[PDB]
């Protein structure tokens, strides 16, 4: 599920800033 972990890595940032 590597292709599913990258898309989540970008959300981890938007969650910290918003």
Residue listed under structure tokens 């972990």: 5
- Between CA 5 and CA 3 the distance in angstroms is 6
DSSP 18: -
Q: Tell which residues of the chain come right before a gap with C–N over 2.5 A.
A: none
Burial per residue of 1-18, b for 16 or more beta-carbon CB atoms within 10 angstroms, e otherwise:
eeeeeeeeeeeeeeeeee
Outline where 1-18 has alpha helix (H): 2-17
Structure solved using which method? Answer: NMR
Kindly list the distances between the CA atom of residue 10 and the CA atoms of 2, 3, 6, 14, 18, in Å, as whole numbers in the listed order. Answer: 13, 12, 7, 7, 12
């Amino acid at each position: 599920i590597f292709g599913a972990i990258w898309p989540l890595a970008l959300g981890a940032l938007k969650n910290l800033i918003k």
